[PDB]
Design an enzyme around this catalytic site. Structure first.
Site, PDB file in Angstrom:
ATOM      1  CG  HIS A   1     101.096   4.684 -92.869  1.00 24.90           C
ATOM      2  ND1 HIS A   1     101.656   5.210 -93.924  1.00 24.90           N
ATOM      3  CD2 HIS A   1     101.731   5.134 -91.672  1.00 24.90           C
ATOM      4  CE1 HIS A   1     102.532   6.132 -93.441  1.00 24.90           C
ATOM      5  NE2 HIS A   1     102.793   6.242 -92.030  1.00 24.90           N
TER       6      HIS A   1
ATOM      7  CG  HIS B   1      97.554  -2.809 -88.770  1.00 26.47           C
ATOM      8  ND1 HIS B   1      98.256  -3.492 -87.515  1.00 26.47           N
ATOM      9  CD2 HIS B   1      98.294  -3.323 -89.717  1.00 26.47           C
ATOM     10  CE1 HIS B   1      99.318  -3.935 -88.033  1.00 26.47           C
ATOM     11  NE2 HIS B   1      99.179  -4.258 -89.227  1.00 26.47           N
TER      12      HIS B   1
ATOM     13  CG  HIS C   1      98.589  -4.683 -94.469  1.00 25.21           C
ATOM     14  ND1 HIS C   1      99.408  -3.898 -94.504  1.00 25.21           N
ATOM     15  CD2 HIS C   1      98.854  -5.383 -93.182  1.00 25.21           C
ATOM     16  CE1 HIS C   1     100.125  -3.759 -93.295  1.00 25.21           C
ATOM     17  NE2 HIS C   1      99.718  -4.569 -92.398  1.00 25.21           N
TER      18      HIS C   1
ATOM     19  CD  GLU D   1     101.481  -6.097 -95.236  1.00 24.99           C
ATOM     20  OE1 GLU D   1     101.805  -6.309 -94.205  1.00 24.99           O
ATOM     21  OE2 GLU D   1     102.030  -5.112 -95.867  1.00 24.99           O
TER      22      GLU D   1
ATOM     23  CG  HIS E   1      99.214  -7.883 -89.865  1.00 24.35           C
ATOM     24  ND1 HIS E   1      99.813  -7.066 -90.759  1.00 24.35           N
ATOM     25  CD2 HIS E   1      99.116  -9.093 -90.365  1.00 24.35           C
ATOM     26  CE1 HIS E   1     100.167  -7.863 -91.911  1.00 24.35           C
ATOM     27  NE2 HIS E   1      99.802  -8.997 -91.663  1.00 24.35           N
TER      28      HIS E   1
ATOM     29  CB  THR F   1     104.851  -5.708 -93.339  1.00 28.17           C
ATOM     30  OG1 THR F   1     103.710  -5.307 -92.667  1.00 28.17           O
ATOM     31  CG2 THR F   1     104.806  -7.208 -93.137  1.00 28.17           C
ATOM     32  CB  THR F   2     104.710  -0.556 -91.663  1.00 24.93           C
ATOM     33  OG1 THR F   2     104.983  -1.200 -90.351  1.00 24.93           O
ATOM     34  CG2 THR F   2     103.628  -1.063 -92.241  1.00 24.93           C
TER      35      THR F   2
HETATM   36  N1  LIG Z   1     102.161  -4.840 -90.403  1.00 28.67           N
HETATM   37  S1  LIG Z   1     102.769  -5.265 -89.035  1.00 28.67           S
HETATM   38  O1  LIG Z   1     101.852  -6.264 -88.175  1.00 28.67           O
HETATM   39  O2  LIG Z   1     104.186  -5.902 -88.971  1.00 28.67           O
HETATM   40  C1  LIG Z   1     102.785  -3.963 -88.024  1.00 28.67           C
HETATM   41  C2  LIG Z   1     103.444  -4.097 -86.765  1.00 28.67           C
HETATM   42  F1  LIG Z   1     103.896  -5.279 -86.177  1.00 28.67           F
HETATM   43  C3  LIG Z   1     103.861  -2.843 -85.962  1.00 28.67           C
HETATM   44  F2  LIG Z   1     103.972  -3.143 -84.785  1.00 28.67           F
HETATM   45  C4  LIG Z   1     103.394  -1.716 -86.343  1.00 28.67           C
HETATM   46  C5  LIG Z   1     102.961  -1.457 -87.531  1.00 28.67           C
HETATM   47  F3  LIG Z   1     102.654  -0.382 -87.973  1.00 28.67           F
HETATM   48  C6  LIG Z   1     102.823  -2.639 -88.548  1.00 28.67           C
HETATM   49  F4  LIG Z   1     102.046  -2.293 -89.591  1.00 28.67           F
HETATM   50 ZN   LIG Z   2     100.303  -5.185 -90.637  1.00 28.32          ZN
END
Ligand SMILES: NS(=O)(=O)c1c(F)c(F)cc(F)c1F
Ligand SMILES: [Zn+2]
Ligand SMILES: NS(=O)(=O)c1c(F)c(F)cc(F)c1F
Ligand SMILES: OC[C@H]1O[C@@H](O)[C@H](O)[C@@H](O)[C@@H]1O
Ligand SMILES: OC[C@H]1O[C@H](O)[C@H](O)[C@@H](O)[C@@H]1O
Length: 257
Positions: A61, A91, A93, A103, A116, A195-196
């Site tokens: 992803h 990570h 996006h 996002e 993030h 968001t996933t």
């Molecule tokens: N996008 S996010 O920061 O909401 C997010 C998370 F917080 C998480 F704990 C695990 C994820 F895969 C993720 F994408």
């Molecule tokens: Zn994220």
């Protein structure tokens, strides 16, 4: 399983994750004029000097840079947060083109990417228990625009060739996430979700106002990653972002006057 394509992307997720249509989903559009300064916010404290990065993983992803979270080596406190939140991973996006990828949006404007930094509330002992709690997680979000290179991102960019496909990982020790921050810690905050999938409604979002600049060459290397596994037909890892979701019964607060 879920993904970002036409047949398994954000518009399909609700069929296996019905909370996708819930009351505090993320991301959201940040209307900068309606966001209100909040004097009850305490100073935000990003304390990453003792961070211990371990590994970088292509999970099909995005890619995660993982940290040792067995002690309070890298923690977020203050701002809207009650107590101490420990960094577990970061990570990004990003888009297929510079005009999309974030996002969160700011007055509907989409940035080229969004970073993030994911943290869990230490009162709950482990990430898994934290994601059973309304205040289990805090995610620090940082927008990326394309301009000058970000020197602190280059070590990430240069390892991506070694984790091209889903399931590949590489050692990623001694990486300092402080080099990914902008100068200012001015932020917006609101209660939301992952968001996933599984889209759990556990997150206090803290979204920095100041974007970081990265070079075109840096983001172009993100776009050479693959969603697919080794030996399978190539599907470029691009447009791995969920669009903005309804704000519903929420207010976005600003840390700045
Ligand atoms: N996008 S996010 O920061 O909401 C997010 C998370 F917080 C998480 F704990 C695990 C994820 F895969 C993720 F994408
Ligand atoms: Zn994220
Ligand atoms: N709801 S979902 O996005 O997770 C999903 C689909 F929509 C689908 F068509 C096939 C899947 F295997 C799947 F997991
Ligand atoms: O009732 C007045 C209150 O309304 C709330 O919706 C706002 O968040 C507060 O800042 C305000 O003081
Ligand atoms: O800091 C993250 C990584 O940066 C570079 O790839 C270094 O060669 C490697 O030793 C280190 O693990």
């Amino acid at each position: 399983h879920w993904g970002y394509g036409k047949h398994n992307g954000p518009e399909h997720w609700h069929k296996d994750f019905p909370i996708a249509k819930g009351e505090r989903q993320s991301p959201v559009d940040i209307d900068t004029h309606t966001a209100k300064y909040d004097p009850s916010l305490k100073p935000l404290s990003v304390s990453y000097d003792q961070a211990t990065s371990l590994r970088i993983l292509n999970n099909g992803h995005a890619f995660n840079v993982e940290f040792d979270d067995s002690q309070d080596k890298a923690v977020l406190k203050g701002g809207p947060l009650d107590g101490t939140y420990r960094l577990i991973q970061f990570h990004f996006h990003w888009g297929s083109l510079d005009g999309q990828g974030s996002e969160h949006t700011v007055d509907k404007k989409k940035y080229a990417a969004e970073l993030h930094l994911v943290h869990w509330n230490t009162k709950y002992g482990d990430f898994g228990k934290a994601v059973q709690q309304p205040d289990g997680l805090a995610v620090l979000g940082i927008f990326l625009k394309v301009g000058s290179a970000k020197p602190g991102l280059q070590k990430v960019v240069d390892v991506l060739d070694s984790i091209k496909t889903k399931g590949k990982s590489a050692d990623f020790t001694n990486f300092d996430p402080r080099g990914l921050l902008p100068e200012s810690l001015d932020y917006w905050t609101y209660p939301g979700s992952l968001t996933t999938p599984p889209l759990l409604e556990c997150v206090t979002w803290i979204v920095l106002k100041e974007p970081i600049s990265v070079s075109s060459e840096q983001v172009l290397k993100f776009r050479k990653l693959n969603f697919n596994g080794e030996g399978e037909p190539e599907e470029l890892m691009v447009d791995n972002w969920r669009p903005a979701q309804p704000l519903k019964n929420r207010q976005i607060k600003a840390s700045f006057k």
